[PDB]
Design an enzyme around this catalytic site. Structure first.
Site, short mmCIF file in Angstrom:
data_model
loop_
_atom_site.label_atom_id
_atom_site.label_comp_id
_atom_site.label_asym_id
_atom_site.label_seq_id
_atom_site.Cartn_x
_atom_site.Cartn_y
_atom_site.Cartn_z
N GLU A 144 0.99 -0.99 -0.10
CA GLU A 144 -0.12 -0.02 -0.21
C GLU A 144 1.02 1.23 0.07
OE1 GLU A 144 -3.72 -0.49 2.13
OE2 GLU A 144 -4.41 1.44 1.34
N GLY A 145 0.70 2.11 -0.92
CA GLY A 145 -0.29 2.56 -1.85
C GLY A 145 -0.76 3.84 -1.15
N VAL A 167 -1.51 -1.80 -4.05
CA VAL A 167 -0.79 -2.06 -5.49
C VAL A 167 -0.36 -3.28 -5.88
CG1 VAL A 167 1.06 -0.80 -6.82
CG2 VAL A 167 0.31 0.31 -5.03
N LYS A 204 -3.14 -0.36 -9.36
CA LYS A 204 -3.53 0.25 -8.05
C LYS A 204 -5.19 0.12 -7.92
CE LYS A 204 -2.41 4.57 -5.43
NZ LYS A 204 -1.98 5.83 -6.05
N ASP A 209 1.72 16.06 -1.07
CA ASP A 209 2.02 14.92 -0.31
C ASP A 209 3.39 14.44 -0.80
OD1 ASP A 209 1.93 13.17 2.06
OD2 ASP A 209 0.57 11.99 1.18
N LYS A 237 6.92 12.82 -0.25
CA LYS A 237 7.45 11.99 0.70
C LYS A 237 8.14 10.88 0.04
CE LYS A 237 3.37 9.24 1.76
NZ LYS A 237 2.20 9.12 2.86
N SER A 238 9.05 10.27 0.72
CA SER A 238 9.95 9.10 0.02
C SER A 238 9.15 8.02 -0.40
CB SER A 238 11.23 8.94 1.04
OG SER A 238 10.76 8.32 2.08
N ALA A 239 7.85 7.68 0.18
CA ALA A 239 7.11 6.79 -0.20
C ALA A 239 6.71 6.90 -1.57
CB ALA A 239 6.06 6.40 0.71
N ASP A 266 1.58 9.49 -7.15
CA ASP A 266 0.53 9.80 -6.03
C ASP A 266 -0.14 11.59 -6.13
OD1 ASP A 266 -0.72 7.60 -4.20
OD2 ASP A 266 -1.79 9.63 -3.86
C1 LIG Z 1 5.37 -5.43 3.43
O1 LIG Z 1 5.73 -4.58 2.50
C2 LIG Z 1 5.63 -3.23 2.94
O2 LIG Z 1 5.10 -2.79 4.04
N1 LIG Z 1 5.98 -2.37 2.08
C3 LIG Z 1 6.87 -2.74 1.02
C4 LIG Z 1 6.00 -2.06 -0.06
N2 LIG Z 1 6.15 -0.62 -0.12
C5 LIG Z 1 5.49 0.06 -1.45
C6 LIG Z 1 6.64 0.33 -2.40
C7 LIG Z 1 6.09 1.18 -3.62
C8 LIG Z 1 4.77 0.69 -4.25
N3 LIG Z 1 4.11 1.18 -5.32
C9 LIG Z 1 4.68 0.88 -6.41
N4 LIG Z 1 5.51 0.17 -6.78
C10 LIG Z 1 6.12 -0.18 -7.95
N5 LIG Z 1 7.30 -1.12 -7.91
C11 LIG Z 1 7.71 -1.73 -6.95
C12 LIG Z 1 7.55 -1.93 -5.49
N6 LIG Z 1 8.39 -2.40 -4.82
N7 LIG Z 1 9.20 -3.10 -5.82
C13 LIG Z 1 10.05 -4.22 -5.52
C14 LIG Z 1 8.85 -2.69 -6.97
N8 LIG Z 1 5.85 0.38 -9.22
C15 LIG Z 1 4.65 1.37 -8.90
C16 LIG Z 1 4.28 2.05 -10.04
C17 LIG Z 1 3.33 2.91 -10.05
C18 LIG Z 1 2.86 3.20 -8.80
C19 LIG Z 1 1.57 4.07 -8.58
C20 LIG Z 1 1.24 4.13 -7.26
N9 LIG Z 1 0.86 4.38 -6.09
N10 LIG Z 1 3.29 2.71 -7.42
C21 LIG Z 1 4.24 1.69 -7.91
C22 LIG Z 1 3.80 0.26 -3.06
C23 LIG Z 1 4.17 -0.54 -1.94
C24 LIG Z 1 5.14 -0.21 0.94
C25 LIG Z 1 5.72 -0.93 2.27
#
Ligand SMILES: COC(=O)N1CCN([C@H]2CC[C@H](Nc3nc(Nc4cnn(C)c4)nc4ccc(CC#N)nc34)CC2)CC1
EC number: 2.7.11.1
Length: 268
Positions: free
Chosen positions: A25-26, A31, A44, A128, A130-132, A146
């Site tokens: 999440e997201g 996601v 998403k 918003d 932020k590094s997330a 986002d």
């Molecule tokens: C148990 O894991 C946790 O608690 N965390 C671990 C995952 N974390 C996040 C990481 C980013 C992720 N979003 C996205 N990710 C990835 N690619 C990706 C992500 N990981 N990898 C290895 C590759 N492409 C995207 C493209 C478009 C969008 C548009 C939006 N919104 N979003 C993403 C959401 C989840 C939360 C904390």
């Protein structure tokens, strides 16, 4: 953009399979890893939530840039997949990824400043930063994401992430000067590798470090992330001086994005 059927999306994400097709999440949703056109994607899955949906599409239509994510379509919102996740997770080495070097951190910081500049040139306020919400591509290029809360001033609905917000944004002002403040917090996470808020840390809020260093109780060298082998005092201090300027309590004393961009360029 392309309009996918919900059934096509349900198929590419294996019924929106919750084990690690789930990526995490997201925004105001989860996601999922998808595969459409031999092409890997991020799906998403999200009345106020319909407003954030339409605003994401509305901003993604207007804003296309090398330092912003790319929306492919909707039903759900479908993006081009970012194989290196969020800067937050890469900073915390989540799931055992290796620590980012100072070299990679500088490119990321510059890329992020470039994305924010494009947004501000297009009269958009993210609200918003932020590094997330900073994602990393196949080259570790930083991409801002986002836009569900982005705006083209006072609000009655206060939005954002407390640990990154400017004081005026916590009171309800809507200004691009707030995005600069948040970015300054992001620069501190990049330098230190510490998350903006840790309830189990003293100080709990990262931003409280400017004061420690500022009231000579601390050195920026004390906080430099120890999981790097290539940091140098001069570029770290120069990145810290940008973060410190972004973090002025007075919105008007803060550098603008064009200034942040130029100073980070002078850093390398
Ligand atoms: C148990 O894991 C946790 O608690 N965390 C671990 C995952 N974390 C996040 C990481 C980013 C992720 N979003 C996205 N990710 C990835 N690619 C990706 C992500 N990981 N990898 C290895 C590759 N492409 C995207 C493209 C478009 C969008 C548009 C939006 N919104 N979003 C993403 C959401 C989840 C939360 C904390």
């Amino acid at each position: 953009f392309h309009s996918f059927s919900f059934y096509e999306l349900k198929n590419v994400t294996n019924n929106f399979d919750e084990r690690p097709n789930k990526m995490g999440e997201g925004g105001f949703g989860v996601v999922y890893k998808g595969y459409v056109n031999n092409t890997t994607v991020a799906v998403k899955k999200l009345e106020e939530l319909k407003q954030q949906f339409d605003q994401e599409i509305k901003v993604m239509a207007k804003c296309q840039h090398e330092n912003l994510v790319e929306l492919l379509g909707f039903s759900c919102l479908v993006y081009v997949y970012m194989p290196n996740g969020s800067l937050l997770d890469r900073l915390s080495c989540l799931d055992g990824t290796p620590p980012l070097s100072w070299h990679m951190r500088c490119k990321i910081a510059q890329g992020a400043a470039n994305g924010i500049n494009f947004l501000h040139e297009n009269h958009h306020i993210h609200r918003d930063i932020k590094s997330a919400n900073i994602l990393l591509d196949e080259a570790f290029t930083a991409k801002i994401s986002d836009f569900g809360l982005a705006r083209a001033v006072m609000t009655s609905r206060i939005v954002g992430t407390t640990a990154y917000m400017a004081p005026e944004a916590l009171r309800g002002e809507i200004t691009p000067k707030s995005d600069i403040y948040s970015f300054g917090v992001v620069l501190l996470e990049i330098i230190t590798g510490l998350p903006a808020v840790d309830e189990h840390r003293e100080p709990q809020l990262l931003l409280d470090i400017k004061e420690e260093i500022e009231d000579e109780e601390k050195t920026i060298e004390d906080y430099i992330d120890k999981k790097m082998n290539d940091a140098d005092s001069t570029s770290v201090e120069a990145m810290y001086s940008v973060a410190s300027q972004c973090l002025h309590e007075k919105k008007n004393k803060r550098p603008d994005i064009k200034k942040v961009q130029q100073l980070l360029q002078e850093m390398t």
